[PDB]
User: Which sequence fits this backbone?
């Protein structure tokens, strides 16, 4: 009688738009809380780390519908949104708040129709539809801010881009210190000003790739483990359970 | 049955702003030069900035107005051009023209008709978003995007217009425009000849457009209008308006109200 699940330590690596087709989910980012009811839209700003508690309505269907944007697209939308609207200058990368990174609204019939006939194959049509949707929302300022913030490239993003070219290699701080011509102290203090370290980034990348590949339903567990750079399958199951809080079979069964 | 003539022919109309028109209740034939484009009952029409046309019009209901119109100023047109270039990608020769590439009718859907309905021209940005949404929904819309870019650049005739509009009732000559622009008279008329116009035509079109617009405000006498556009007498003004457009100011006002 488990139509509920708790998941820990999820990263949003792409600006994400979510629609609750059938679930109710509470979100604990750090030490706050935002709950999302049945029929709503959610805007998730790129680079937040959050934990979730979900309850489904119907078991024979999946909990939600998701739209994600890559970097080219995100930049385009930022550009055209700059042209159509104004330009703000809270450009100081200082104070954050969870309530400026997560947002929910109540979906209408007219928004729902356009949401229906969205097919993420025609790129320009997709950009048009998102701008149309944003225009119909009240207090949309908070969204445009979050779309600009997530368009700038930090040093951690360069480290990530470097790592993604060979995920099954065995990286160390010394090797990263070679590609960027600097010292280990320089690189570790640079990543320390953004409140992270090298092991954290490597772990988040590998567990993101694994969670995504599990849902394709076209590779054994050993194939996934060899793809992300891990010796044995049983070791991989231990680490997945310790990071996310559930087993790969439970994850797959819930989200199908 | 003479008072029941609710059909009309108008001559020498000049489009000074990119225009989107919706045939709420009439039927319309458009003779630009020596071609013809007809527009049926329930359709959308796209008119490219700077074309000169003549029109024949027949109403469906007599006690109501003929159509609904949207016009865009320069700032707004430029913004739409910019964001449009962003979304669809950058891609002029300025060679072959065609009246079939400057005036285009389409068939509007019911949901598009709704989006057009809930248009209130108070939120400026919202209008740009709705218009981009509409354009994306159109099949074979490439021919449209071209006409919005073509009419977004500033030509030499636009410099002449901007100079003259700062004092409409003054008495200009080709000599004065030849001094302000550091050049010769032959230079100026050969430059304007390459855009297919001359200076007297531009002056006359400007004065007749401002007048036709003021007539519909319904709050200025004829002598007031004539003084405002730079013309001596009211009777002279009526003569010129009738010769240019093909109808009398009473006929124009009575029809379009
Ligand atoms: C099952 C929830 C979907 C996301 C799971 C974690 C994947 C990282 C998201 C991303 O790459 O932007
Ligand atoms: C019913 C309109 C009669 C024609 C008047 C000419 C005005 C065109 C200038 C403009 O586009 O603003």
Assistant:
């Amino acid at each position: 009688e488990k139509e509920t699940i708790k998941i820990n330590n999820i990263m949003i690596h792409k600006y994400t738009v979510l629609y609750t087709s059938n679930c109710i989910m509470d979100i604990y980012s750090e030490e706050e809380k935002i709950t999302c009811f049945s029929n709503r839209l959610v805007f998730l700003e790129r680079g937040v780390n959050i934990s979730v508690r979900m309850q489904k309505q119907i078991l024979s269907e999946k909990p939600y519908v998701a739209f994600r944007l890559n970097g080219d697209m995100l930049r385009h939308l930022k550009d055209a949104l700059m042209i159509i609207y104004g330009m703000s200058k809270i450009d100081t990368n200082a104070c954050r708040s969870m309530s400026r990174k997560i947002m929910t609204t109540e979906v209408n019939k007219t928004l729902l129709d356009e949401l229906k006939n969205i097919n993420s194959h025609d790129n320009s049509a997709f950009i048009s539809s998102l701008i149309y949707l944003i225009s119909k929302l009240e207090n949309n300022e908070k969204i445009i801010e979050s779309i600009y913030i997530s368009s700038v490239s930090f040093f951690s993003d360069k480290v990530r881009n470097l790592i993604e070219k060979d995920l099954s290699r065995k990286w160390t701080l010394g090797i990263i210190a070679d590609a960027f011509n600097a010292s280990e102290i320089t690189i570790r203090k640079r990543l320390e000003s953004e409140n992270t370290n090298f092991n954290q980034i490597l772990m988040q990348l590998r567990m993101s790739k694994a969670a995504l590949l599990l849902l394709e339903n076209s590779y054994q567990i050993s194939q996934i483990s060899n793809m992300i750079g891990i010796s044995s399958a049983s070791y991989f199951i231990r680490i997945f359970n310790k990071h996310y809080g559930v087993t790969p079979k439970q994850f797959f069964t819930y989200f199908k």
User: Anything to note?
Assistant: The domain at 155-255 of chain A is CATH 1.10.10.60 (Arc Repressor Mutant, subunit A). Chain A touches chain B at residues 76, 79-80, 83-85, 110, 113, 124-125, 127-129, 131-132, 134-135 (CB under 8 Å). The first strand of chain A starts at residue 4 and ends at 11.
